[PDB]
Amino acid sequence: GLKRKIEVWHVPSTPDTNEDGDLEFAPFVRHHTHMQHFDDVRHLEWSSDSRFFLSASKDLTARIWSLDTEEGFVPTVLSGHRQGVVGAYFSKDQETIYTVSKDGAVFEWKYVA
């Protein structure tokens, strides 16, 4: 998470990891960018199945993002705090997610009707 832009790059194939390997020139390859977002992006956290990730902003918002295009899904927002969020994480059973926001307010969210 750069000052506003959000990025996801691959990991590079290491000369440690391939048997007949070499230093590449351009070691990273840039997978997706995201400009859906309005202020500083201050924390990010992966899921445990490595398929979704949470973005806790500096503009009182959090967003859920797909690694790749899921089927029954829309990348989505979560709002409602009073002073910008510092953390946001998945549950172990990835249904509920928590956010913890800068004036000391922890919100547990579920995806209900």
Partner 1 sequence: KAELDRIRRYKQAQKKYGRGPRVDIKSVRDKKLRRTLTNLENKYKTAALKAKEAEILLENQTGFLEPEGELERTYKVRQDEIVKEVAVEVAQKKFELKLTELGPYTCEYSRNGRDLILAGRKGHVATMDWREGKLGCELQLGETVRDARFLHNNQFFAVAQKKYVYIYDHNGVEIHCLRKHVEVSHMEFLPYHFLLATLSISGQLKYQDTSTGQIVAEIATKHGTPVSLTQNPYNAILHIGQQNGTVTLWSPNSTDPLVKLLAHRGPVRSLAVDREGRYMVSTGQDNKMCIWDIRNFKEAVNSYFTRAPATSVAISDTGLTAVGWGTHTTIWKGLFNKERPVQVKVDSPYMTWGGQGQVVERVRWCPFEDILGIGHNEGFSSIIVPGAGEANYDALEVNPFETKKQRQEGEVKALLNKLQPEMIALDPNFIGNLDLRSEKQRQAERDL
Partner RNA sequence: UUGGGCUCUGUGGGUGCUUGGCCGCUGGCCAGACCUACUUCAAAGCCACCGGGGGUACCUACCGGUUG
Partner RNA sequence: CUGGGGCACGCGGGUACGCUAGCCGC
For residue 34, list its beta bridge partners: 6
What distance in Å separates the CA atoms of residue 71 and residue 58, rounded to the nearest whole number? Answer: 29
Write the DSSP symbol of residue 18.
Answer: S
For residue 91, state whether it binds RNA (rule: CB under 7 A).
no
For residue 107, state whether it binds RNA (rule: CB under 7 A).
no
Using CB under 7 A, count the residues that bind RNA: 21
C-beta closer to RNA: residue 75 or 91: 75
> Which residue in 19, 22, 103, 108 binds RNA (CB under 7 A)?
103
C-beta closer to RNA: residue 8 or 48: 8
Write the DSSP symbol of residue 111.
Answer: -
For residue 60, state whether it binds partner 1 (rule: CB under 8 A).
yes
Q: Give the range of 14-22, 23-31, 39-47, 89-97 binding RNA by CB under 7 A.
A: 23-31
Which of positions 27-66 make contact with RNA (CB under 7 A)? Answer: 27-30, 32-36, 65-66
CA-only gyration radius of the chain, Å: 16
Helix, coil or strand: residue 55: strand
Site residues, partner 1 (CB under 8 A): 38, 59-60, 79-80, 82-83
